[PDB]
């Protein structure tokens, strides 16, 4: 019938977030093996993992303990300075005139074409991470899908989102008339999980200090590559993914894989979006780590493997990271006290709306709350994104931008 | 038979802790009404509540919404600078030569005498608060009881402790051969509750900004004064207190009243320790607040009743209190990370030993952990006491004082 396009994104940088770029390279390898074309697949990756000083396999990136290189041949479409939300939206809309840097490869698709999107890092309620100190907002991503559908750019779309609280990105704001089906790693109020970590089973190669993959991401990729996709349906991937990501239904070390959008697309066979490898005829509870805590796990492995020349330097960096996230956590807490009073501030900032309801009523107000906070308390990092439900709850409580300016002023200025 | 002695203590100062000194004055009024004598009753109270600028009833202190003055005639035994743990132990042992300041009134009791002790503020695991920036340790209090028993200073003793985690003060370290019976407001890992707060039911007089009493304290006093104590047993007080302090068995806004020591004393009638009022022939779920959070509740009432001349001054003080306790909380958290690693530090610092087991194996090591922490992170306040279980767990994990010095150095120096 048509052409199969793909956009693969890792919204994080640094060796502590090695897994997000590893998932992306593997996904690129998977799609090429299934007969998709390089020109039709756009890769967003900062490109700071394969040649990083801390890499024990120079120019090699792996996603599972089997140690296959997934880096070779991955195209440098949008790297470093180029991994922006502006370029992401430009690549999805298919306009080269709106792109800033990179290869220039965009999704200029015809109406009969199918698109597969995969995002890996990261996130928090209503937001996704971008490497160059950026926050991608849920409503903005939805707006691009609405604009792409309104110009006749595709027939069907399947999106896979790997990030904490990825369900808030679609709950209450995703239409079903866009011919887009979406699955997320977690529900609107949960965190995602990391796999193949140093000191866990299945154990990655001993020379590694950072984790290699993410529970939801590796579930779908290792599933598609162990099955004939001409037989396997989109629904059957979701059921196997949901089961693996749940971790034997232990949601204390698992997450709920959710589905949003046009559900009729689950009858379609996975090969219409992922292709098929003509070679494939062939049709226990894991030890996982929190997404926001894998950075400290990696840093602690660096500390426990080093000597004194230098080991006290790593320990000071561990303290600076912990103090920094304790400043973000404490400032949000205080702002809630200064705005709602003690005993009312926490129940307001940490309240969770029922499923099917959008995170925030005004998305532009969510962007101003972050703007006001960063102006007094300094930059929110990827960890700092976690208070996006508290910022949204500030909007829904009716509290003004001047009351937020006065609170951030008393909390940090 | 003999004489009934009493020691009444409030280990806190400031108008935010009005209730602890109010409980003490009422208890003094109760005991005098029951025929005990001024000379035999020692009162420890900082004495900064009745004439405080914020008091809407100058020279008057109340404990219930009925508004009876409990301040009149309460003796100034040990006030201000004199409310120390050193004087507390000296008063209990009955030696005037070891007292520093005050009235000089001590418990010089004969072997046939009975003693009733009441402590009101807050506390934490193994510790009690004292006003002049002091921490009373559980083992030290037990040591005085052992020394007093070994010299034949009494026949029976009944102690009532009102403070968070008051059960840790006796669990695993209280002997039963001392002829001492003890009840506590909470178990070893729970917090105590405050009653008669502004904005709750039963509502105190509108002119009040701070709470008037504590759930456990008011339960026993209002119970003894509504019954003939010549009939009422010690066990029957504990059962009525336990029921009231449990708050309709809702332990999310209640606590477990515990019992320790010689249990045969529960058969004895309450009048042998509390006396009897010859006049007394006569034989819903409350809205309560956490002990560590009533200071902020009081400050928020000050903020919501004031105007601009001054209301922004109160708000800045609220922020400084919140930042200060966020520094204490964040430093303890980090010390656990620097000592046990991320993901292992919190489960180590917040682990709870099973009932009947002492909080810490080495009590002198608990005092050095606090000493090392305060030397780098600054003074622990009454709120800051809350990390005493984490300091004790540091001792029980086997970690050295030099490792604690290196951790507090990286966390705060």
PDB file of C-alpha atoms in Angstrom, chain A residues 233-374:
ATOM      1  CA  UNK A 233      -1.158  -7.709  16.067  1.00  0.00           C
ATOM      2  CA  UNK A 234      -0.648  -4.273  17.763  1.00  0.00           C
ATOM      3  CA  UNK A 235      -2.983  -5.454  20.603  1.00  0.00           C
ATOM      4  CA  UNK A 236      -0.881  -8.591  21.180  1.00  0.00           C
ATOM      5  CA  UNK A 237       2.231  -6.391  21.620  1.00  0.00           C
ATOM      6  CA  UNK A 238       0.382  -4.228  24.160  1.00  0.00           C
ATOM      7  CA  UNK A 239      -0.748  -7.326  26.110  1.00  0.00           C
ATOM      8  CA  UNK A 240       2.794  -8.829  26.286  1.00  0.00           C
ATOM      9  CA  UNK A 241       4.319  -5.389  27.068  1.00  0.00           C
ATOM     10  CA  UNK A 242       1.655  -4.669  29.743  1.00  0.00           C
ATOM     11  CA  UNK A 243       2.399  -8.058  31.352  1.00  0.00           C
ATOM     12  CA  UNK A 244       6.174  -7.585  31.361  1.00  0.00           C
ATOM     13  CA  UNK A 245       6.111  -3.926  32.487  1.00  0.00           C
ATOM     14  CA  UNK A 246       3.689  -4.867  35.344  1.00  0.00           C
ATOM     15  CA  UNK A 247       6.486  -7.143  36.775  1.00  0.00           C
ATOM     16  CA  UNK A 248       4.272 -10.108  37.887  1.00  0.00           C
ATOM     17  CA  UNK A 249       1.563  -7.524  38.908  1.00  0.00           C
ATOM     18  CA  UNK A 250       3.890  -6.023  41.555  1.00  0.00           C
ATOM     19  CA  UNK A 251       3.216  -2.293  40.943  1.00  0.00           C
ATOM     20  CA  UNK A 252       5.649  -1.383  43.791  1.00  0.00           C
ATOM     21  CA  UNK A 253       8.403  -2.365  41.222  1.00  0.00           C
ATOM     22  CA  UNK A 254       6.188  -2.133  38.068  1.00  0.00           C
ATOM     23  CA  UNK A 255       3.917   0.208  36.085  1.00  0.00           C
ATOM     24  CA  UNK A 256       0.549   0.116  34.199  1.00  0.00           C
ATOM     25  CA  UNK A 257       0.932   0.150  30.368  1.00  0.00           C
ATOM     26  CA  UNK A 258      -1.917   2.358  29.111  1.00  0.00           C
ATOM     27  CA  UNK A 259      -3.645   2.832  25.715  1.00  0.00           C
ATOM     28  CA  UNK A 260      -5.133   6.048  24.204  1.00  0.00           C
ATOM     29  CA  UNK A 261      -6.605   7.171  20.844  1.00  0.00           C
ATOM     30  CA  UNK A 262      -8.064   5.141  17.952  1.00  0.00           C
ATOM     31  CA  UNK A 263      -8.364   1.599  19.387  1.00  0.00           C
ATOM     32  CA  UNK A 264      -9.442  -0.027  16.077  1.00  0.00           C
ATOM     33  CA  UNK A 265      -5.682   0.101  15.084  1.00  0.00           C
ATOM     34  CA  UNK A 266      -4.996  -2.730  17.633  1.00  0.00           C
ATOM     35  CA  UNK A 267      -6.535  -5.206  15.079  1.00  0.00           C
ATOM     36  CA  UNK A 268      -3.887  -4.174  12.488  1.00  0.00           C
ATOM     37  CA  UNK A 269      -0.740  -6.282  12.243  1.00  0.00           C
ATOM     38  CA  UNK A 270       2.481  -4.791  13.740  1.00  0.00           C
ATOM     39  CA  UNK A 271       4.235  -5.211  10.365  1.00  0.00           C
ATOM     40  CA  UNK A 272       2.205  -2.292   8.918  1.00  0.00           C
ATOM     41  CA  UNK A 273       4.196   0.084  11.253  1.00  0.00           C
ATOM     42  CA  UNK A 274       7.322  -1.951  12.297  1.00  0.00           C
ATOM     43  CA  UNK A 275       7.821  -4.070   9.126  1.00  0.00           C
ATOM     44  CA  UNK A 276       8.856  -7.745   9.189  1.00  0.00           C
ATOM     45  CA  UNK A 277      12.160  -9.608   9.314  1.00  0.00           C
ATOM     46  CA  UNK A 278      11.829 -12.355   6.681  1.00  0.00           C
ATOM     47  CA  UNK A 279      14.157 -14.563   8.724  1.00  0.00           C
ATOM     48  CA  UNK A 280      11.711 -14.715  11.710  1.00  0.00           C
ATOM     49  CA  UNK A 281       9.420 -17.783  11.334  1.00  0.00           C
ATOM     50  CA  UNK A 282       9.453 -18.275  15.196  1.00  0.00           C
ATOM     51  CA  UNK A 283       6.115 -16.685  16.326  1.00  0.00           C
ATOM     52  CA  UNK A 284      10.840 -14.564  36.542  1.00  0.00           C
ATOM     53  CA  UNK A 285      10.261 -11.166  38.290  1.00  0.00           C
ATOM     54  CA  UNK A 286      13.001  -8.686  37.124  1.00  0.00           C
ATOM     55  CA  UNK A 287      15.053  -6.456  39.471  1.00  0.00           C
ATOM     56  CA  UNK A 288      14.273  -2.926  38.306  1.00  0.00           C
ATOM     57  CA  UNK A 289      15.264   0.644  39.376  1.00  0.00           C
ATOM     58  CA  UNK A 290      13.229   3.933  39.416  1.00  0.00           C
ATOM     59  CA  UNK A 291      13.955   6.370  36.463  1.00  0.00           C
ATOM     60  CA  UNK A 292      14.860   9.363  38.649  1.00  0.00           C
ATOM     61  CA  UNK A 293      17.158   7.200  40.861  1.00  0.00           C
ATOM     62  CA  UNK A 294      19.348   5.512  38.178  1.00  0.00           C
ATOM     63  CA  UNK A 295      21.650   8.597  38.027  1.00  0.00           C
ATOM     64  CA  UNK A 296      22.637   8.180  41.693  1.00  0.00           C
ATOM     65  CA  UNK A 297      22.968   4.371  41.241  1.00  0.00           C
ATOM     66  CA  UNK A 298      25.472   5.014  38.358  1.00  0.00           C
ATOM     67  CA  UNK A 299      27.365   7.659  40.455  1.00  0.00           C
ATOM     68  CA  UNK A 300      27.557   5.258  43.422  1.00  0.00           C
ATOM     69  CA  UNK A 301      29.099   2.552  41.135  1.00  0.00           C
ATOM     70  CA  UNK A 302      31.709   5.180  40.027  1.00  0.00           C
ATOM     71  CA  UNK A 303      32.436   5.928  43.707  1.00  0.00           C
ATOM     72  CA  UNK A 304      32.697   2.208  44.667  1.00  0.00           C
ATOM     73  CA  UNK A 305      35.068   1.288  41.810  1.00  0.00           C
ATOM     74  CA  UNK A 306      37.508   4.253  42.032  1.00  0.00           C
ATOM     75  CA  UNK A 307      40.586   4.905  44.209  1.00  0.00           C
ATOM     76  CA  UNK A 308      42.095   8.040  45.861  1.00  0.00           C
ATOM     77  CA  UNK A 309      43.961  10.296  43.359  1.00  0.00           C
ATOM     78  CA  UNK A 310      39.448  11.215  42.935  1.00  0.00           C
ATOM     79  CA  UNK A 311      37.003   8.958  44.873  1.00  0.00           C
ATOM     80  CA  UNK A 312      36.308  11.943  47.259  1.00  0.00           C
ATOM     81  CA  UNK A 313      35.574  14.060  44.109  1.00  0.00           C
ATOM     82  CA  UNK A 314      32.778  11.637  43.056  1.00  0.00           C
ATOM     83  CA  UNK A 315      31.385  11.711  46.616  1.00  0.00           C
ATOM     84  CA  UNK A 316      31.269  15.548  46.590  1.00  0.00           C
ATOM     85  CA  UNK A 317      29.380  15.411  43.231  1.00  0.00           C
ATOM     86  CA  UNK A 318      26.896  12.919  44.778  1.00  0.00           C
ATOM     87  CA  UNK A 319      26.288  15.431  47.614  1.00  0.00           C
ATOM     88  CA  UNK A 320      25.810  18.320  45.148  1.00  0.00           C
ATOM     89  CA  UNK A 321      23.227  16.393  43.118  1.00  0.00           C
ATOM     90  CA  UNK A 322      21.346  15.401  46.336  1.00  0.00           C
ATOM     91  CA  UNK A 323      21.430  18.995  47.732  1.00  0.00           C
ATOM     92  CA  UNK A 324      20.186  20.322  44.392  1.00  0.00           C
ATOM     93  CA  UNK A 325      17.148  18.021  44.244  1.00  0.00           C
ATOM     94  CA  UNK A 326      16.480  18.655  47.982  1.00  0.00           C
ATOM     95  CA  UNK A 327      16.361  22.439  47.135  1.00  0.00           C
ATOM     96  CA  UNK A 328      13.799  21.854  44.315  1.00  0.00           C
ATOM     97  CA  UNK A 329      11.684  19.514  46.568  1.00  0.00           C
ATOM     98  CA  UNK A 330      11.814  21.867  49.556  1.00  0.00           C
ATOM     99  CA  UNK A 331      10.985  24.992  47.556  1.00  0.00           C
ATOM    100  CA  UNK A 332       7.853  23.457  45.980  1.00  0.00           C
ATOM    101  CA  UNK A 333       6.749  22.234  49.463  1.00  0.00           C
ATOM    102  CA  UNK A 334       7.220  25.774  50.942  1.00  0.00           C
ATOM    103  CA  UNK A 335       5.444  27.476  48.008  1.00  0.00           C
ATOM    104  CA  UNK A 336       2.418  25.286  48.794  1.00  0.00           C
ATOM    105  CA  UNK A 337       2.627  26.339  52.494  1.00  0.00           C
ATOM    106  CA  UNK A 338       2.972  30.076  51.581  1.00  0.00           C
ATOM    107  CA  UNK A 339      -0.011  29.747  49.185  1.00  0.00           C
ATOM    108  CA  UNK A 340      -2.467  27.298  50.938  1.00  0.00           C
ATOM    109  CA  UNK A 341      -1.091  27.109  54.496  1.00  0.00           C
ATOM    110  CA  UNK A 342       0.515  24.193  56.330  1.00  0.00           C
ATOM    111  CA  UNK A 343      -1.582  21.023  56.230  1.00  0.00           C
ATOM    112  CA  UNK A 344      -3.464  22.267  53.173  1.00  0.00           C
ATOM    113  CA  UNK A 345      -0.497  22.941  50.812  1.00  0.00           C
ATOM    114  CA  UNK A 346       0.672  19.314  50.465  1.00  0.00           C
ATOM    115  CA  UNK A 347      -2.890  17.858  49.891  1.00  0.00           C
ATOM    116  CA  UNK A 348      -3.347  20.599  47.211  1.00  0.00           C
ATOM    117  CA  UNK A 349       0.025  20.092  45.423  1.00  0.00           C
ATOM    118  CA  UNK A 350      -0.073  16.297  45.507  1.00  0.00           C
ATOM    119  CA  UNK A 351      -3.781  15.689  44.675  1.00  0.00           C
ATOM    120  CA  UNK A 352      -4.419  13.369  41.708  1.00  0.00           C
ATOM    121  CA  UNK A 353      -7.368  13.961  39.355  1.00  0.00           C
ATOM    122  CA  UNK A 354      -9.327  10.808  38.352  1.00  0.00           C
ATOM    123  CA  UNK A 355      -8.335   9.042  35.088  1.00  0.00           C
ATOM    124  CA  UNK A 356      -9.788  10.438  31.860  1.00  0.00           C
ATOM    125  CA  UNK A 357      -9.482  13.998  33.255  1.00  0.00           C
ATOM    126  CA  UNK A 358      -6.780  16.345  31.859  1.00  0.00           C
ATOM    127  CA  UNK A 359      -3.894  17.269  34.153  1.00  0.00           C
ATOM    128  CA  UNK A 360      -4.386  21.049  33.828  1.00  0.00           C
ATOM    129  CA  UNK A 361      -7.270  23.221  32.539  1.00  0.00           C
ATOM    130  CA  UNK A 362      -4.961  25.991  31.220  1.00  0.00           C
ATOM    131  CA  UNK A 363      -1.787  24.695  29.510  1.00  0.00           C
ATOM    132  CA  UNK A 364      -0.361  28.209  28.995  1.00  0.00           C
ATOM    133  CA  UNK A 365      -0.701  28.765  32.822  1.00  0.00           C
ATOM    134  CA  UNK A 366       1.326  25.579  33.434  1.00  0.00           C
ATOM    135  CA  UNK A 367       4.143  27.172  31.304  1.00  0.00           C
ATOM    136  CA  UNK A 368       3.979  30.432  33.301  1.00  0.00           C
ATOM    137  CA  UNK A 369       4.165  28.564  36.653  1.00  0.00           C
ATOM    138  CA  UNK A 370       7.416  26.888  35.531  1.00  0.00           C
ATOM    139  CA  UNK A 371       8.613  30.331  34.194  1.00  0.00           C
ATOM    140  CA  UNK A 372       7.956  32.087  37.523  1.00  0.00           C
ATOM    141  CA  UNK A 373       9.561  29.221  39.583  1.00  0.00           C
ATOM    142  CA  UNK A 374      12.755  29.062  37.447  1.00  0.00           C
TER     143      UNK A 374
END
